[PDB]
Symmetry: D2
Subunit: 440 residues, 4 copies
Amino acid sequence: SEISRQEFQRRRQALVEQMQPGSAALIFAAPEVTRSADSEYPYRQNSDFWYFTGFNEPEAVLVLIKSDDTHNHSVLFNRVRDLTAEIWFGRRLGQDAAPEKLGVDRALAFSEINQQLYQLLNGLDVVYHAQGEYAYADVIVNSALEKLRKGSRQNLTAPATMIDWRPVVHEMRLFKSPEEIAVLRRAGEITAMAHTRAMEKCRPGMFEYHLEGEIHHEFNRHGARYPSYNTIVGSGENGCILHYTENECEMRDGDLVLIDAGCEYKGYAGDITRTFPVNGKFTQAQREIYDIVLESLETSLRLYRPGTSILEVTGEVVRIMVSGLVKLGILKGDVDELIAQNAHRPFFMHGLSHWLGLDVHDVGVYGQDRSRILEPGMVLTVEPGLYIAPDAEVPEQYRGIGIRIEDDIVITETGNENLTASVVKKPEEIEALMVAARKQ
Amino acid sequence: SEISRQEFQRRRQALVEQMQPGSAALIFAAPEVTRSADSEYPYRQNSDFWYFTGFNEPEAVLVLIKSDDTHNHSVLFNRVRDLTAEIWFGRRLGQDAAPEKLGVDRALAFSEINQQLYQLLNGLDVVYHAQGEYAYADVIVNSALEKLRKGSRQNLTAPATMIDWRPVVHEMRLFKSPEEIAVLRRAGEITAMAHTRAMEKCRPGMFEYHLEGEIHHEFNRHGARYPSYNTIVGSGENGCILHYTENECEMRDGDLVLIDAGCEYKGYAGDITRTFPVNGKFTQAQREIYDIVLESLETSLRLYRPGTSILEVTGEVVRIMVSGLVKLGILKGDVDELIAQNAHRPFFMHGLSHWLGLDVHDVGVYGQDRSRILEPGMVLTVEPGLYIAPDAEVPEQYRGIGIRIEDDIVITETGNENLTASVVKKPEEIEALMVAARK
Amino acid sequence: SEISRQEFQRRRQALVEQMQPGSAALIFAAPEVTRSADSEYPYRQNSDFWYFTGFNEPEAVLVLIKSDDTHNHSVLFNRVRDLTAEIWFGRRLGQDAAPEKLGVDRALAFSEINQQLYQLLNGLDVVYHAQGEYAYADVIVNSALEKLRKGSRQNLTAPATMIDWRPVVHEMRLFKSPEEIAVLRRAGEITAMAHTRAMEKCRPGMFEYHLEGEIHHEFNRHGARYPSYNTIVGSGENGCILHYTENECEMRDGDLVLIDAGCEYKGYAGDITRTFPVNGKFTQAQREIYDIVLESLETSLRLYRPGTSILEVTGEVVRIMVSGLVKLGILKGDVDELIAQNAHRPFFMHGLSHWLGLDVHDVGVYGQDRSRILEPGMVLTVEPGLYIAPDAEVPEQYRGIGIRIEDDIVITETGNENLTASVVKKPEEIEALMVAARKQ
Amino acid sequence: SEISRQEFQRRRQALVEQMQPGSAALIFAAPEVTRSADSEYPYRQNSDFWYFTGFNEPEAVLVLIKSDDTHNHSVLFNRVRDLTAEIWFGRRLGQDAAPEKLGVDRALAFSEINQQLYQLLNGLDVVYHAQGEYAYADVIVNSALEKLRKGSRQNLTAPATMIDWRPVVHEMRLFKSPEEIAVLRRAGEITAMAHTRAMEKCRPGMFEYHLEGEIHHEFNRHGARYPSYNTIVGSGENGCILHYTENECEMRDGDLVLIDAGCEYKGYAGDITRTFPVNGKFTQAQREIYDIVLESLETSLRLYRPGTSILEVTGEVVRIMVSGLVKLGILKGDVDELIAQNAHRPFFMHGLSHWLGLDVHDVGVYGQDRSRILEPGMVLTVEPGLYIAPDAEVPEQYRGIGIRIEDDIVITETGNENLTASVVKKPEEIEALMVAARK
Ligand SMILES: [Cl-]
Ligand SMILES: [Cl-]
Ligand SMILES: [Cl-]
Ligand SMILES: [Cl-]
Ligand SMILES: [Mg+2]
Ligand SMILES: [Mg+2]
Ligand SMILES: [Mg+2]
Ligand SMILES: [Mg+2]
Ligand SMILES: [Mg+2]
Ligand SMILES: [Mg+2]
Ligand SMILES: [Zn+2]
Ligand SMILES: [Zn+2]
Ligand SMILES: [Zn+2]
Ligand SMILES: [Zn+2]
């Protein structure tokens, strides 16, 4: 699936609808990024610029101008077509094709932006600008405004009001359209397939990075070339390290491996975690911790729906975790008192859920303690985990165990839709999947 | 293959040997790099910092202090061990383990660098610093020097002399040690295996990015997790675009595909290009252009040795190219006159060779027009190509053809060693490789 | 005369009245300014900061907070009292005395501004800030806003709207109160006395800078320690150079000297120009040019009143100049055609009038071509001039003559009040003044 | 007195003599400085730029190029001649007149500096630059060096070595030539005349700023248009505030007034302090403190010579101060023990002497605690003072008294010459001067 020309147009108009008359919104592309010396990382467009354009070049600026409540138009600054520069550094859209391709009224060369931007802003009352997002963008905007302020003899005037559009745009991004949900649906599926493959390929004696290799190959073959974030493959005690991305250890018989990986498909993030035994067989101790995390996930999946919140669902998970840990002798005391003193926190130190979209930790207001009431169209993760340090003062058999299970969901009218349930998570289904693969 | 602890030590001492007495050299780690919002790209250490340390963390600074011709020592600034911060953002070496691990005399917390660096530079005559390399580094160094200049009442003095160490260090990097050649040999082998795999897997109807996928999987399984540069898979008319990395087209029966891909193994770059038919069989027209490029490569491989230059070998390649293009009717006229007017340029617009090492386009002085005399230990690519535009005024059968063949070599006492010859390039061998895989 | 505590309070309230509810205005002091190495120029407060405070220290910030249409309050950031630092670098108001002295509700140490400003801006909808005025101020404001934007987990929010207050404040400054007019009245008088003295002291053989010395001594003895701008004493051919401040030549018998000088009194600028013969006696040629400039001034003084404009009065002056120059053979042709082609411009290349106040070239919107309609309370200069280059192609006797005559006026209900008429400008009165002094 | 063309030339050559071959020194003019909105303060040239040029324009850069031990030349960047811009903003030297006027081999437009500077630095080994002095200068220099570093394909190379010339130049400035001593002699005389005038004009009921007015008028009439620093006129309890420049109080019968004021003449600073009674007659209490300060000055004037130091002479002054304060009951105890515990510090908190020249607090290395051995040609102030706070726990009659007496001297082969002794400092002579003026 993909985003249509008409959708990009609808988004631009939804922003313009919220703008004051006599205003302009400026949305800048991401700069290119050095990896080492003259080599650059694969280009990643700014999510907000992408959201309004689907255009994957640097040195571009979308300018939306609202004259009044009926009249508005768009100007794109982008790199010019150059025979030599493209033979070398790849094809460029240019100014002639841009209006039709990207649905903008006017396209100008980015090399002319300082000569042109101030003319577009002259006489307007408001400029919408994400100040501080990029230094190169702030320089450009500040120069334009300075030319206008100081140009009274040339009959120039600067808009006195500057408004950050990020709160408005991020509120838009928080609610997914049907097109976006279909894309995320595909991202979840591609990501699930990768996690299934990793489970099937896994053997003791491989390195953690081998499973990363399988995962990335799977992303790529469905047309999702890049991960949405750096892949985590934490086996044994590496599973207790939340942002373990070294993936440098040999996977040992008797250890669990925690895999957190997600593709980026048409700009949108998948985000799945699965934890499973390297040898295809949960031990009793591993199973005992796993069940607590699974129950937490399964219960959260039942509960998530409009009218509740991440805070509220989290409270239920905490109860499950504390009860489970008390039954295993990992915690000692009264469940309610332990809950009151957040006794689970040494073992579950992160949030249960984050928004998901064009960024893996997506934009949008959470409310205090993530108390915002959920509504249809919100997309989020559900990712309970339990991490028992190698030196934790608990029954010895639980030490050095890190387990997280994470799905991606969209809130619907009546509940939620799980976008990542096509990869197994019940322990017996994990074992059966692995057995079958090892036959073959 | 790997770089030993002793090697890193040798390199540090080789720099210190070239430093003035009463001086300090400051070598800064690369910053972390945003991909989107709060997510970052996989960390890539600064090549120069890596060269002296093999240490893969940001927010670190290596300080080499030379008191005099016999006395020198090292101070590392790096991130402190933090229980919480590491549970989250991965393990850190810290200050206790660093001396032994990285062979430095002293390790200090990076958070203390502004409180400590000026004290280390106080009273020295010279500071070696790569000014302009990173803005965060310049801020730190300038603050230290300012404190010193303005601190006369506190008996502080700033070194008046600042020297850019990059010329010295890059001249070091230009000559590979045996350990480095062994690592580059492994990178060449890993890279060659990936290119072989791509040729064997290729079928019409796959997309260009599928071959990129095969290639990266191969890099990964030998322990080279990242490419050294963005992979090019340009099929058909995409072959004529030199930095084509979109790799977004369906590969079609009848087209050639040009693959330029290289792994990064222990920091060192492989860099191979192979061009081959998507359907496993060169057409006559494809073969006619391919042979010119292959002769150019094979001749260059015979010629490269100490005492010649990239400029000199390039002159031979140009003659091969012009002669071949005249035979095919792509160029018209007298070969020498065509050569004199660089008539090949529309078809071969880039250099024949670049240095290779910790960066794919490696550091080191080339000389004017790459005329520097070659010596043993230099590592470079050999990559002739011909690129005929879709709308070129030439016979139709040559339009939209892009062919490059690239190997990595090391200059030896008497010649060169080819590090990437384990992937085939003779057209008959390419065809046979593909036929065998398709059985 | 001076500005009262109550006036500074009225000004702050007039700004607050124009502010949106749930907003804060930030007004920063001027930085100290290096003259050479560790020595600094005499401190000059930012005119806008001065306007709301009458406070002459650097490292201070006035913060006006409007909660709603009835509730507002003020916070001052200023330097703390320090025993040692003051023994050295002079007395400081400090935090204890500031509320009563400057009429602010709260005073905080400037050293704490980064720890405190964001707390003041937290949860507001609008911040008023003169972006680009000072780099140190922009750093402070941008840091505060960045802390708020990124502080959602700490329940912080940044105002999304930033408004430049300069247009509003400069519009306030354009209309002088009675207190301000009384101060400007005194500045005009002090400045007039200085120009009278210069005429009386002038002898051939003195250097231009000697008259500058007399002028500055006169400013100082009335308590106006500093000029409002760099003093011009251009004798002979130096008179044709508009911003001649070298004042390095010996004044010659037979030359004119053009003196443009003004005091700064309680922050307000005087701005007078007088031109006169070094030897106390206008020649015929000098008199012929002088009369044209004088008629221009005298006519402009009759005309200035509410309902006209600088543009309109300028048109009358141009006619006077062109007619006069044609009569002398400096211009040749039809007066109306010469006027149509702006034939006067080689000889009068600057504006007739600028606003005057806390800055010599004062703030306030002029309108296109200075066409804004004049209203009571506006204060401006009237300064026709004629400058004939040494190499100008005109009758030889006029070459190298530079004459300007400048008064300061305030627009009243019925006309204007000339604040600087106490120094003579009629040629015979200049001559008589000089004769009397030479007896011385 | 004035600095000749030949002197400026000598200074440039003295710098070039100390430069390495294959180097360039870059000396930047001061920027213009805003007073309020579009109005600027009177321009003050950078002292170092002035030292080598005597040129009083902004947007100028002196470039001294040393090819080798015999060959060197100079390039000036300065503002172009512009008919319109000068009619408005005053005359400019321009490019045609500059070679002859300023004795430079070549003059270029400042507008072309970014297009030209890199070409001048290309291929040199060393660039001398005062990094951090001005932001606009650093931008220019860094841009040039960047162009050079990145311009290898255009056969450009950057000098790898950057040296701060300030230590060398400031060491030059520390030793005055005969021409400079003659100019400083004139500045001392002009300044002394102004202080004499202030004493003669002073009456109770005038404000402190009226004496500032007299002083500046005097500076001006001898052709010293600007003070070298902001004038201090601290009467009564304002005398105890070291950098009192408000000068806003009415001067009262019974009080002392402390006047610290100095002219700037041809760039060089006078720096005189005199303290005297507003009513022309010292009280006993005033005289008792005054005598201690005067003895301190007079003794210092006898002692200063080559071979001693500011530290050494200061030690004698401290003994004089402590002894005197003990006699008056301001300090209590054993003189040596009081000296050992620096018991004078509450009353004399600043240094006895600072270097003097193109800056009032002039450049040059002092040594630790100002222990550097004095040599002929050094110019410095001698300024003992005693400042007793209004709330000091001492006998009442000494509270709120601030007295400083300051002269400017030059060290000679055998001693010193006092450049400011033409204004009186003995209390009887001050009184007689004031009595005579009041007749
Ligand atoms: Cl462009
Ligand atoms: Cl740290
Ligand atoms: Cl403070
Ligand atoms: Cl210029
Ligand atoms: Mg995840
Ligand atoms: Mg390659
Ligand atoms: Mg074809
Ligand atoms: Mg004027
Ligand atoms: Mg002094
Ligand atoms: Mg007393
Ligand atoms: Zn997640
Ligand atoms: Zn290559
Ligand atoms: Zn004026
Ligand atoms: Zn002094």
